[PDB]
Amino acid sequence: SKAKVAIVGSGNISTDLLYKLLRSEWLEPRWMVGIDPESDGLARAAKLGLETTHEGVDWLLAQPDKPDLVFEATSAYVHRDAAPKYAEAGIRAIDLTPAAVGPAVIPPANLREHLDAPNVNMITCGGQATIPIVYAVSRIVEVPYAEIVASVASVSAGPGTRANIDEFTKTTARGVQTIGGAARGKAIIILNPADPPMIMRDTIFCAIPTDADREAIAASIHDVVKEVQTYVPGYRLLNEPQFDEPSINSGGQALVTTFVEVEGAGDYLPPYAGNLDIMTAAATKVGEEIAKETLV
Amino acid sequence: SKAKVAIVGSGNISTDLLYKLLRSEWLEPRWMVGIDPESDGLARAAKLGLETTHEGVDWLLAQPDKPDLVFEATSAYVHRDAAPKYAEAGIRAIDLTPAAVGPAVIPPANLREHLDAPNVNMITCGGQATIPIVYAVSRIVEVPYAEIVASVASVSAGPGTRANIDEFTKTTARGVQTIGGAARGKAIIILNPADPPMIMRDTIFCAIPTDADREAIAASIHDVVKEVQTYVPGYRLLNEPQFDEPSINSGGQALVTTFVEVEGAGDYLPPYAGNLDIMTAAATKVGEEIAKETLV
Amino acid sequence: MWDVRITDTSLRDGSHHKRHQFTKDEVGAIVAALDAAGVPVIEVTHGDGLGGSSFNYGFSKTPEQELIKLAAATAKEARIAFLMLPGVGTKDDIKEARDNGGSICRIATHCTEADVSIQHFGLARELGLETVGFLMMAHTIAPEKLAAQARIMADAGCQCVYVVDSAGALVLDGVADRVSALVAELGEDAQVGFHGHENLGLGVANSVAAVRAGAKQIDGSCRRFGAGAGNAPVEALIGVFDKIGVKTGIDFFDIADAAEDVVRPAMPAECLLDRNALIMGYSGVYSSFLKHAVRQAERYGVPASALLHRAGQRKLIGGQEDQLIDIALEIKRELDSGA
Amino acid sequence: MWDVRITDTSLRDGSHHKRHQFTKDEVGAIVAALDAAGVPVIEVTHGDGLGGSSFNYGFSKTPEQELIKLAAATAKEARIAFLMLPGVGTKDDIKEARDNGGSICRIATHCTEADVSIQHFGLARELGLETVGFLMMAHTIAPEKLAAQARIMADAGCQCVYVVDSAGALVLDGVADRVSALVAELGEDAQVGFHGHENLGLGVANSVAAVRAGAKQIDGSCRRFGAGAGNAPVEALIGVFDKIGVKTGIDFFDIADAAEDVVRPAMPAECLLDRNALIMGYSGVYSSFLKHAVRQAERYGVPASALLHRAGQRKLIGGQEDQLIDIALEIKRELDSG
Ligand SMILES: O=C([O-])C(=O)[O-]
Ligand SMILES: O=C([O-])C(=O)[O-]
Ligand SMILES: [Mn+2]
Ligand SMILES: [Mn+2]
Ligand code: NA
C-alpha cells in the first residue's frame, strides 16, 4: 500500500515533484494545495487525479482522510506558519523551503538518523549535490576544511536564490560542516548565462591528511556517487577524484578534488535545471525512505 | 708693416672673416671680391674702407697692386677654377671652401709643416674644433681610433653643410686620421633646432692604451685648448678630460673623452654661430703665421 | 579636486599576481607611499574579493581583514576600498570590512547578473559605506544590455557603476560605447567608472576612451600590479592625464617613485604581455585565470595556452577557475584516446 | 595583401635594448620566425642606423652589414629593411646595405631637418631601393610644420613618410593629427607611417589612431624589443588589428609563438615601463638615451631619472647621447656641493 502524500505549493518545484511522486513505488500524491485559483500548477494536478484547492493549508488540515506525508515548496514564511499545524495534526512534513524548522537531511549522509523526525528539511541544491562527496571523504579521513563550488545556468536560478544568495552560501557551508563532517565549510555559487543553458556542475575540494589513504578515499567517493545515482540518475562523476600535495595555493593543505555534473530528469523541469531537479529527487527519496521505515 | 690681404666671396663667412682681419696685427684687408653688386657683404666691406668689386676674381687679378694673401670663402667649384690663377699670379691662397686643392691645416697640429705652401685648406669647422684635441692625445699616446660628435644650431647650418652632410662627416673623419694622428677616424654631426640657438659644442672620444699616462694626456689636452684659445677666445673645455676603462659600450677599448664648447665672437655672425666663427678665426691664424714666417 | 577619481588596485587586483601572498609590511609600505602621492582610493582585498581565500582562488598568506585594518590605520587621506562578489563574499563580510576601516564597498557581479547584488548595495549604504558596482566581463554583452544591468545596481543604491574589462578584451570604441551607454542611462543617478586589463596592451588608452565618454572614476595599479598582463599602470595614467588636461590630484613624479621604489619590489616579477596573457585578451578569458592555468599546466603536463584557449571556448566567467582542472583532464583524456 | 604593412624593428630598434650585442645566431633565428609568421618587413641595423657603431651610441658585437647579409639570405618572403641617419651613416653605407641584400632604405632625420636627406633618397631610388622617411621626435613641432617636412622627403623620392614618436610622448589625438596632416599634404605622392614608443603605455593605441587617420605602414617590435619602454608590441598589434578589421597578413597565434619562443630568449630582459622610461615619455626624451643614461648614472653616481629629466630640459634630440655625460657631471657637481 502506497503512502498517501500531499503537496503544498503549486509552482515549478511542486509540479516537478508531483511528476516524480506519480512514478514512486512507495508514495501516492493525492492532494495539491495552493492559494492562487489561477495557478497552472493546480490545473495540472487536477487533470492527473489529485484533489486540489486554493484555500491553503487550512483546507488540507480539515480533511477526513489525513495525508501520511506532506511535501511543502512554498516559502520559508509560509512553511514556518504551517509546520506547527502539521505536527499537531500528526502529519510528517518534508520541507523544500529555507524554513529549516526541522533537521536538514542528505540521504547518503544522515537520512537514517532522522527517519523518525516529524519535520525534515532538504537544505539547498548545492548541499544535496556536494555534501554526499564531503561525507564520502570524511567517513574515511579527518577533513579539517571542505569547499564546494556550484555552477548553475543563470536561467535556472529564480528570484529565490537570487534574492538570498548569501543564505545559499552560508547554509550550504553550514551543511558541509554539520552533515558533511568537515570541521569548516565554505560554499561558492557561480551563475553562468551561457546559451544553451549549462547543466549544473559542482566542484568539491576536501582538505585531507598528507598521508591519507587515497585509494580508500577514491573508492568511498565512487560508492557515494553510485548511491546518489539510485535517486538522481543524471548525477555523474566528471573525472576520477584528483589528489594534491600541500602548496601555496592550498595553504599548505593536502586535498582531494571531485567534479560532479547534475543533469535533471526532465520530468517537468528541463535537464539544465539539475539544481531544482535534485531538490525534488532528494525529497522524493527521503519520503520513500520514511514511508518504508516508519509507515509500512 | 702689414700684408695686404684680399677676401674672395661676400657671403657670411667672408663678411665675418672681414672683422677678424681688421683686428689683425699682421694682416690688413683691402679687397672684397664679389659678383652680386648688391651683396650685403660688399656694402659692409666698402663701408669699412675696403675696395670692393662685383666683376669677380678676374677683376682682382688685374690690379697693379698685388694682394700678398687671398682668402676665399666661395664654393668648391669656384675655388678650383680660381686656384691656379692665384698660383700663376704668385698669390698665396687660404681656402675656406671644400675644394682642398692644397693641404688641410689645423694650427696647433700641422700648420708649421705647410707655411711655405702656395695653397692651404681649412678643412671643416668640426675639424678645426676637434682635431686639436685628437692631436693633443695622439702626441702623447697611440690612438687607434678617434670619434668626434659635432652639435650645431640648425639655423647656423647653411646650404653648404646641408647639401653635403656626408662630405662633412667623411672629410672630418679623414682629417681626424691624417692630421689628428688617430689610426682611424669617425665624425658625427647633429643639427639641433632649439630656440634660442645652442652654442656649438663638440665631444671628442679617443681610444687610448689601457696603461696610458692619463696625467700626461690631460696636461696635453689643456695645453692645446689654451693654444686654440689664442685665436678662438670663446673656445673652452666644459669639463676635465674623462677617462674610462674597457667596456661593452667601448668595444673593449680604454678611452679619454673631451667636451668643448665654441662660442663665436659675435662679429658679423651671432655668438651661437661658432661653427662659422672657428673657420674665420683659424683661417686668420694661418694667414698670420704665413705672413710672419714666409713674408715679414 | 579632480576631474577623475583614481582607484589603485595594486593590493586587490594585484593580489592575483602576488598569488595572495601579501604581508602586512608590504601593504603598509604600499598604502603609505600611495597615500602620500595623492592616490584618493586604495583597494585592498583578496583578488576575488571578500571571502576569496580558498582552494578555488588560492589561500591568502595574510587574512584580508587584517590587511584592510592595517591599510585603514595607515592611510591619512586615501580611503580604503574593498571588493566583494555575491556568491563568494557575504553581507557579514562587508560589515566586518566596514568595522575594520574600509569606507568604499565595491560589489562585483558578472555583467548579466546584477540582480544578485541588490541586497548588498542596500546593506552597504545602510552601513554608511560609499558604493561602487562592477559589471564584470563587460565585453560579453552589448552596451544597451550592460546599461540595463547598471540601472539595476543604481536603483539598489549603487553610486558608481563600472564597465569592467575583466579579460582585457575591449578595444577603444568598445569601451567608449559601453561607458557612454551607462552615462546615458544613469544620468545624475550614478557615476560611471572603467576598470581595464592590459591583455591587448590597451589599458591606458581604454581608460582615456572611458574618460572622454564620460567616466569619472578609473581603476589602475601601480606598475600594472594585477591579474593577467596587469591593470592600467597608474603612473602612466597620471602622466597621460596630465598631458590631456585631466586632473587627478596625483603627482606624477611621486607616484612614479612609489611604483618603482615601493610597489615593484613587492611584485614577484613584472606583469608580462606574454603569450598566455595575449591569448586571454584575444579569447575573452577572465584575467585572474592566468596563474591558475599555469598551475594546472604544471600539475597535469598540458600547455597553459591550451587551457586558456579552451576556457574561452567554454565561455567560463569570473570565479570558475575550478573548470581549468576539468579542462586539463579533458586534454589528457583526448591525448590518450586520440579523439 | 593587407590594409597595413607591419615592419618589425626587433633587430634594429631592439638593438638599443640589446645594446647592439646581436649575434648571427640570434638574427638568423628571429628573422626566420618572423618571416614564417608572415611579417612582411624586418628591419636590421645598429639601433642608430648604418654607421651607428661608435663610442657615442655603443659598439656592435657583430658588424651590422653581416647581420643584414644574413637576414637577407634567411628571409624567404619578408623584405629586409635598414635604417640610416644623415650625419651618422653615409650614402656609401646605403650602397653597401643594398649590396648585402637590404631592399628597404629608411632614412631618418630630426623632424625639422628633412632637407639634409634629399640626396640620400635620390641615391636610394637610383639604387632601386624602396624608400621610407622617418621624421624623428615628431611631438616637438605642430602637425602643419611636420607636414611641410614630409613634403621635402616625398619630393626627394621618399615613398612613405613616418610620424615618429621617438620619445613615446604623443597621446592619441596627437598622433592622429600628425598622420592626418601628412596624409592631406602628401596625397598620392607618398604613404604615411607611424612608429611609436611605449613610454606612456600608448604604443598599440597610438598605432590604431595612426591607422584610423590613414597610416598604411606601422612599426612595432615583437615583445616590444626596442628603445625605452619599447616599441609597440607586434603580437598585440596583430591581435588588436584582428579585432578591428585591419588586415596585416600576419597570424596572431604564430607571431605570439615567435615573440614568446624565439624573440624573448634573445632579449636581455623585458622592456620595462619603469620610472626612467616614464620620465622619458613625460619629458619628451629620445628613447635610445635610456641605457646610456643608466650607464652614465652608474659611472658618475647620480640618479638616472634626474639625468633623463634634464635631457628633456636641455631639449636634446636623437644622436646627442654624449650630452648625457655632460649632464651627469653637472648633476654630480651640484651633489658634490650639497
Ligand atoms: O578585478 C575584476 O573584478 C575584474 O577585472 O573583473
Ligand atoms: O627611429 C627611431 O628609432 C626613433 O627615433 O624612434
Ligand atoms: Mn580586474
Ligand atoms: Mn624608435
Ligand atoms: Na587569483
PDB file of N, CA, C and O in Angstrom, chain C residues 173-225:
ATOM      1  N   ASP C 173      36.843  51.972 -28.940  1.00  0.00           N
ATOM      2  CA  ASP C 173      35.427  52.310 -29.117  1.00  0.00           C
ATOM      3  C   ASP C 173      34.498  51.367 -28.355  1.00  0.00           C
ATOM      4  O   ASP C 173      33.435  51.782 -27.897  1.00  0.00           O
ATOM      5  N   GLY C 174      34.905  50.106 -28.221  1.00  0.00           N
ATOM      6  CA  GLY C 174      34.171  49.144 -27.418  1.00  0.00           C
ATOM      7  C   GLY C 174      34.040  49.579 -25.969  1.00  0.00           C
ATOM      8  O   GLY C 174      33.038  49.295 -25.316  1.00  0.00           O
ATOM      9  N   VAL C 175      35.056  50.268 -25.456  1.00  0.00           N
ATOM     10  CA  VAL C 175      34.986  50.823 -24.108  1.00  0.00           C
ATOM     11  C   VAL C 175      34.092  52.074 -24.100  1.00  0.00           C
ATOM     12  O   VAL C 175      33.213  52.221 -23.246  1.00  0.00           O
ATOM     13  N   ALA C 176      34.315  52.956 -25.068  1.00  0.00           N
ATOM     14  CA  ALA C 176      33.562  54.203 -25.178  1.00  0.00           C
ATOM     15  C   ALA C 176      32.061  53.991 -25.346  1.00  0.00           C
ATOM     16  O   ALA C 176      31.261  54.733 -24.765  1.00  0.00           O
ATOM     17  N   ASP C 177      31.687  53.002 -26.156  1.00  0.00           N
ATOM     18  CA  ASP C 177      30.284  52.708 -26.415  1.00  0.00           C
ATOM     19  C   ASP C 177      29.600  52.233 -25.143  1.00  0.00           C
ATOM     20  O   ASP C 177      28.449  52.572 -24.873  1.00  0.00           O
ATOM     21  N   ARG C 178      30.322  51.445 -24.361  1.00  0.00           N
ATOM     22  CA  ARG C 178      29.779  50.909 -23.121  1.00  0.00           C
ATOM     23  C   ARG C 178      29.661  51.986 -22.049  1.00  0.00           C
ATOM     24  O   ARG C 178      28.633  52.081 -21.366  1.00  0.00           O
ATOM     25  N   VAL C 179      30.708  52.798 -21.914  1.00  0.00           N
ATOM     26  CA  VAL C 179      30.701  53.891 -20.943  1.00  0.00           C
ATOM     27  C   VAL C 179      29.610  54.913 -21.266  1.00  0.00           C
ATOM     28  O   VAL C 179      28.841  55.314 -20.391  1.00  0.00           O
ATOM     29  N   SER C 180      29.527  55.320 -22.528  1.00  0.00           N
ATOM     30  CA  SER C 180      28.523  56.301 -22.926  1.00  0.00           C
ATOM     31  C   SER C 180      27.108  55.765 -22.727  1.00  0.00           C
ATOM     32  O   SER C 180      26.224  56.508 -22.322  1.00  0.00           O
ATOM     33  N   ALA C 181      26.896  54.477 -23.001  1.00  0.00           N
ATOM     34  CA  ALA C 181      25.581  53.874 -22.787  1.00  0.00           C
ATOM     35  C   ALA C 181      25.171  53.945 -21.313  1.00  0.00           C
ATOM     36  O   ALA C 181      24.024  54.269 -20.992  1.00  0.00           O
ATOM     37  N   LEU C 182      26.109  53.646 -20.417  1.00  0.00           N
ATOM     38  CA  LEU C 182      25.841  53.776 -18.988  1.00  0.00           C
ATOM     39  C   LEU C 182      25.595  55.225 -18.569  1.00  0.00           C
ATOM     40  O   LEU C 182      24.723  55.480 -17.748  1.00  0.00           O
ATOM     41  N   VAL C 183      26.359  56.167 -19.121  1.00  0.00           N
ATOM     42  CA  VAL C 183      26.154  57.586 -18.785  1.00  0.00           C
ATOM     43  C   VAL C 183      24.768  58.029 -19.232  1.00  0.00           C
ATOM     44  O   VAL C 183      24.051  58.733 -18.504  1.00  0.00           O
ATOM     45  N   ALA C 184      24.392  57.615 -20.438  1.00  0.00           N
ATOM     46  CA  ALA C 184      23.095  57.988 -20.990  1.00  0.00           C
ATOM     47  C   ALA C 184      21.960  57.434 -20.126  1.00  0.00           C
ATOM     48  O   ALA C 184      20.980  58.128 -19.862  1.00  0.00           O
ATOM     49  N   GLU C 185      22.110  56.196 -19.661  1.00  0.00           N
ATOM     50  CA  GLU C 185      21.081  55.561 -18.838  1.00  0.00           C
ATOM     51  C   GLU C 185      21.052  56.086 -17.400  1.00  0.00           C
ATOM     52  O   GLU C 185      19.977  56.328 -16.843  1.00  0.00           O
ATOM     53  N   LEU C 186      22.225  56.244 -16.794  1.00  0.00           N
ATOM     54  CA  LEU C 186      22.296  56.623 -15.384  1.00  0.00           C
ATOM     55  C   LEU C 186      22.045  58.113 -15.138  1.00  0.00           C
ATOM     56  O   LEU C 186      21.451  58.480 -14.128  1.00  0.00           O
ATOM     57  N   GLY C 187      22.498  58.962 -16.055  1.00  0.00           N
ATOM     58  CA  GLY C 187      22.361  60.399 -15.877  1.00  0.00           C
ATOM     59  C   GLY C 187      22.947  60.819 -14.543  1.00  0.00           C
ATOM     60  O   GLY C 187      24.083  60.478 -14.223  1.00  0.00           O
ATOM     61  N   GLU C 188      22.142  61.501 -13.735  1.00  0.00           N
ATOM     62  CA  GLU C 188      22.600  62.029 -12.453  1.00  0.00           C
ATOM     63  C   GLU C 188      22.543  61.024 -11.305  1.00  0.00           C
ATOM     64  O   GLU C 188      23.019  61.304 -10.207  1.00  0.00           O
ATOM     65  N   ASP C 189      21.975  59.851 -11.560  1.00  0.00           N
ATOM     66  CA  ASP C 189      21.778  58.846 -10.519  1.00  0.00           C
ATOM     67  C   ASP C 189      23.051  58.178 -10.016  1.00  0.00           C
ATOM     68  O   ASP C 189      23.131  57.783  -8.849  1.00  0.00           O
ATOM     69  N   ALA C 190      24.037  58.038 -10.894  1.00  0.00           N
ATOM     70  CA  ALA C 190      25.270  57.365 -10.528  1.00  0.00           C
ATOM     71  C   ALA C 190      26.400  57.785 -11.458  1.00  0.00           C
ATOM     72  O   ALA C 190      26.167  58.172 -12.603  1.00  0.00           O
ATOM     73  N   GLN C 191      27.623  57.730 -10.956  1.00  0.00           N
ATOM     74  CA  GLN C 191      28.775  57.970 -11.808  1.00  0.00           C
ATOM     75  C   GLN C 191      29.068  56.694 -12.572  1.00  0.00           C
ATOM     76  O   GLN C 191      28.521  55.632 -12.263  1.00  0.00           O
ATOM     77  N   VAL C 192      29.917  56.806 -13.583  1.00  0.00           N
ATOM     78  CA  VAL C 192      30.328  55.645 -14.359  1.00  0.00           C
ATOM     79  C   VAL C 192      31.844  55.503 -14.260  1.00  0.00           C
ATOM     80  O   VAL C 192      32.585  56.498 -14.289  1.00  0.00           O
ATOM     81  N   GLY C 193      32.305  54.269 -14.127  1.00  0.00           N
ATOM     82  CA  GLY C 193      33.722  54.019 -13.977  1.00  0.00           C
ATOM     83  C   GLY C 193      34.215  53.065 -15.052  1.00  0.00           C
ATOM     84  O   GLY C 193      33.415  52.448 -15.752  1.00  0.00           O
ATOM     85  N   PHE C 194      35.530  52.976 -15.210  1.00  0.00           N
ATOM     86  CA  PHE C 194      36.107  51.943 -16.061  1.00  0.00           C
ATOM     87  C   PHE C 194      37.304  51.306 -15.392  1.00  0.00           C
ATOM     88  O   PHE C 194      38.117  51.981 -14.758  1.00  0.00           O
ATOM     89  N   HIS C 195      37.412  49.995 -15.573  1.00  0.00           N
ATOM     90  CA  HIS C 195      38.477  49.219 -14.997  1.00  0.00           C
ATOM     91  C   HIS C 195      38.901  48.250 -16.089  1.00  0.00           C
ATOM     92  O   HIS C 195      38.134  47.363 -16.468  1.00  0.00           O
ATOM     93  N   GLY C 196      40.109  48.433 -16.613  1.00  0.00           N
ATOM     94  CA  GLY C 196      40.550  47.632 -17.741  1.00  0.00           C
ATOM     95  C   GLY C 196      41.802  46.816 -17.484  1.00  0.00           C
ATOM     96  O   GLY C 196      42.610  47.133 -16.606  1.00  0.00           O
ATOM     97  N   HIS C 197      41.968  45.751 -18.259  1.00  0.00           N
ATOM     98  CA  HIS C 197      43.185  44.967 -18.179  1.00  0.00           C
ATOM     99  C   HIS C 197      44.063  45.163 -19.405  1.00  0.00           C
ATOM    100  O   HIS C 197      43.616  45.686 -20.417  1.00  0.00           O
ATOM    101  N   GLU C 198      45.315  44.725 -19.303  1.00  0.00           N
ATOM    102  CA  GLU C 198      46.345  45.069 -20.283  1.00  0.00           C
ATOM    103  C   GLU C 198      46.645  43.969 -21.299  1.00  0.00           C
ATOM    104  O   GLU C 198      47.661  44.028 -21.994  1.00  0.00           O
ATOM    105  N   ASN C 199      45.746  42.992 -21.403  1.00  0.00           N
ATOM    106  CA  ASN C 199      45.990  41.779 -22.184  1.00  0.00           C
ATOM    107  C   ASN C 199      46.116  41.993 -23.693  1.00  0.00           C
ATOM    108  O   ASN C 199      46.594  41.109 -24.415  1.00  0.00           O
ATOM    109  N   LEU C 200      45.676  43.156 -24.171  1.00  0.00           N
ATOM    110  CA  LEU C 200      45.888  43.511 -25.565  1.00  0.00           C
ATOM    111  C   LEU C 200      46.730  44.774 -25.637  1.00  0.00           C
ATOM    112  O   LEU C 200      46.845  45.398 -26.690  1.00  0.00           O
ATOM    113  N   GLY C 201      47.331  45.136 -24.507  1.00  0.00           N
ATOM    114  CA  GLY C 201      48.206  46.297 -24.462  1.00  0.00           C
ATOM    115  C   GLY C 201      47.459  47.613 -24.627  1.00  0.00           C
ATOM    116  O   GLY C 201      48.003  48.565 -25.188  1.00  0.00           O
ATOM    117  N   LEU C 202      46.223  47.674 -24.134  1.00  0.00           N
ATOM    118  CA  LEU C 202      45.369  48.866 -24.302  1.00  0.00           C
ATOM    119  C   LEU C 202      44.822  49.436 -22.993  1.00  0.00           C
ATOM    120  O   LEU C 202      43.862  50.196 -23.012  1.00  0.00           O
ATOM    121  N   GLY C 203      45.420  49.079 -21.864  1.00  0.00           N
ATOM    122  CA  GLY C 203      44.945  49.552 -20.576  1.00  0.00           C
ATOM    123  C   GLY C 203      44.816  51.063 -20.430  1.00  0.00           C
ATOM    124  O   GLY C 203      43.762  51.580 -20.034  1.00  0.00           O
ATOM    125  N   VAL C 204      45.886  51.780 -20.744  1.00  0.00           N
ATOM    126  CA  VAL C 204      45.884  53.228 -20.593  1.00  0.00           C
ATOM    127  C   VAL C 204      44.932  53.898 -21.575  1.00  0.00           C
ATOM    128  O   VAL C 204      44.115  54.728 -21.188  1.00  0.00           O
ATOM    129  N   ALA C 205      45.026  53.534 -22.847  1.00  0.00           N
ATOM    130  CA  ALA C 205      44.171  54.143 -23.860  1.00  0.00           C
ATOM    131  C   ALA C 205      42.683  53.831 -23.694  1.00  0.00           C
ATOM    132  O   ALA C 205      41.836  54.673 -23.986  1.00  0.00           O
ATOM    133  N   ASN C 206      42.362  52.608 -23.285  1.00  0.00           N
ATOM    134  CA  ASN C 206      40.972  52.287 -22.995  1.00  0.00           C
ATOM    135  C   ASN C 206      40.450  53.194 -21.869  1.00  0.00           C
ATOM    136  O   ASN C 206      39.297  53.641 -21.897  1.00  0.00           O
ATOM    137  N   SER C 207      41.303  53.472 -20.888  1.00  0.00           N
ATOM    138  CA  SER C 207      40.912  54.339 -19.775  1.00  0.00           C
ATOM    139  C   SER C 207      40.677  55.771 -20.253  1.00  0.00           C
ATOM    140  O   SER C 207      39.750  56.428 -19.790  1.00  0.00           O
ATOM    141  N   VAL C 208      41.499  56.236 -21.194  1.00  0.00           N
ATOM    142  CA  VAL C 208      41.311  57.551 -21.797  1.00  0.00           C
ATOM    143  C   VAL C 208      39.997  57.610 -22.575  1.00  0.00           C
ATOM    144  O   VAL C 208      39.253  58.598 -22.503  1.00  0.00           O
ATOM    145  N   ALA C 209      39.713  56.549 -23.325  1.00  0.00           N
ATOM    146  CA  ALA C 209      38.459  56.450 -24.067  1.00  0.00           C
ATOM    147  C   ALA C 209      37.266  56.549 -23.116  1.00  0.00           C
ATOM    148  O   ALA C 209      36.298  57.261 -23.383  1.00  0.00           O
ATOM    149  N   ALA C 210      37.359  55.847 -21.994  1.00  0.00           N
ATOM    150  CA  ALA C 210      36.306  55.864 -20.991  1.00  0.00           C
ATOM    151  C   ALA C 210      36.076  57.280 -20.454  1.00  0.00           C
ATOM    152  O   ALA C 210      34.936  57.745 -20.351  1.00  0.00           O
ATOM    153  N   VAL C 211      37.168  57.956 -20.114  1.00  0.00           N
ATOM    154  CA  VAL C 211      37.097  59.321 -19.599  1.00  0.00           C
ATOM    155  C   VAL C 211      36.460  60.270 -20.607  1.00  0.00           C
ATOM    156  O   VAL C 211      35.595  61.071 -20.252  1.00  0.00           O
ATOM    157  N   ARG C 212      36.861  60.180 -21.870  1.00  0.00           N
ATOM    158  CA  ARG C 212      36.252  61.042 -22.883  1.00  0.00           C
ATOM    159  C   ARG C 212      34.769  60.729 -23.079  1.00  0.00           C
ATOM    160  O   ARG C 212      33.989  61.608 -23.424  1.00  0.00           O
ATOM    161  N   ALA C 213      34.386  59.475 -22.841  1.00  0.00           N
ATOM    162  CA  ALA C 213      32.987  59.058 -22.949  1.00  0.00           C
ATOM    163  C   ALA C 213      32.144  59.429 -21.719  1.00  0.00           C
ATOM    164  O   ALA C 213      30.933  59.208 -21.705  1.00  0.00           O
ATOM    165  N   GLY C 214      32.782  59.968 -20.685  1.00  0.00           N
ATOM    166  CA  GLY C 214      32.053  60.457 -19.526  1.00  0.00           C
ATOM    167  C   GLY C 214      32.388  59.789 -18.203  1.00  0.00           C
ATOM    168  O   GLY C 214      31.756  60.083 -17.195  1.00  0.00           O
ATOM    169  N   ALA C 215      33.383  58.903 -18.188  1.00  0.00           N
ATOM    170  CA  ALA C 215      33.726  58.185 -16.955  1.00  0.00           C
ATOM    171  C   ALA C 215      34.370  59.125 -15.946  1.00  0.00           C
ATOM    172  O   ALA C 215      35.200  59.942 -16.310  1.00  0.00           O
ATOM    173  N   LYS C 216      33.996  58.998 -14.679  1.00  0.00           N
ATOM    174  CA  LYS C 216      34.527  59.875 -13.639  1.00  0.00           C
ATOM    175  C   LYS C 216      35.381  59.137 -12.618  1.00  0.00           C
ATOM    176  O   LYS C 216      35.984  59.749 -11.740  1.00  0.00           O
ATOM    177  N   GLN C 217      35.436  57.813 -12.737  1.00  0.00           N
ATOM    178  CA  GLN C 217      36.284  57.021 -11.877  1.00  0.00           C
ATOM    179  C   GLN C 217      37.008  56.028 -12.774  1.00  0.00           C
ATOM    180  O   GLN C 217      36.408  55.476 -13.695  1.00  0.00           O
ATOM    181  N   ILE C 218      38.301  55.839 -12.525  1.00  0.00           N
ATOM    182  CA  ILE C 218      39.138  54.949 -13.332  1.00  0.00           C
ATOM    183  C   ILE C 218      39.992  54.127 -12.379  1.00  0.00           C
ATOM    184  O   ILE C 218      40.555  54.672 -11.422  1.00  0.00           O
ATOM    185  N   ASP C 219      40.067  52.819 -12.628  1.00  0.00           N
ATOM    186  CA  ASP C 219      40.967  51.934 -11.895  1.00  0.00           C
ATOM    187  C   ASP C 219      42.307  51.749 -12.596  1.00  0.00           C
ATOM    188  O   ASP C 219      42.374  51.618 -13.826  1.00  0.00           O
ATOM    189  N   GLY C 220      43.368  51.678 -11.802  1.00  0.00           N
ATOM    190  CA  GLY C 220      44.637  51.176 -12.288  1.00  0.00           C
ATOM    191  C   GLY C 220      45.421  50.548 -11.158  1.00  0.00           C
ATOM    192  O   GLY C 220      44.985  50.548 -10.017  1.00  0.00           O
ATOM    193  N   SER C 221      46.595  50.024 -11.473  1.00  0.00           N
ATOM    194  CA  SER C 221      47.518  49.582 -10.443  1.00  0.00           C
ATOM    195  C   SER C 221      48.899  50.125 -10.753  1.00  0.00           C
ATOM    196  O   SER C 221      49.316  50.144 -11.912  1.00  0.00           O
ATOM    197  N   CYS C 222      49.604  50.569  -9.721  1.00  0.00           N
ATOM    198  CA  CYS C 222      50.985  50.972  -9.896  1.00  0.00           C
ATOM    199  C   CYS C 222      51.768  49.795 -10.447  1.00  0.00           C
ATOM    200  O   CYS C 222      51.576  48.656  -9.995  1.00  0.00           O
ATOM    201  N   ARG C 223      52.609  50.066 -11.448  1.00  0.00           N
ATOM    202  CA  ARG C 223      53.456  49.045 -12.059  1.00  0.00           C
ATOM    203  C   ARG C 223      52.626  47.923 -12.699  1.00  0.00           C
ATOM    204  O   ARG C 223      53.118  46.816 -12.904  1.00  0.00           O
ATOM    205  N   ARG C 224      51.361  48.222 -13.003  1.00  0.00           N
ATOM    206  CA  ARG C 224      50.427  47.265 -13.618  1.00  0.00           C
ATOM    207  C   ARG C 224      50.031  46.117 -12.687  1.00  0.00           C
ATOM    208  O   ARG C 224      49.310  45.224 -13.098  1.00  0.00           O
ATOM    209  N   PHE C 225      50.506  46.161 -11.446  1.00  0.00           N
ATOM    210  CA  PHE C 225      50.301  45.117 -10.441  1.00  0.00           C
ATOM    211  C   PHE C 225      48.845  44.592 -10.406  1.00  0.00           C
ATOM    212  O   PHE C 225      47.969  45.189  -9.790  1.00  0.00           O
TER     213      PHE C 225
END
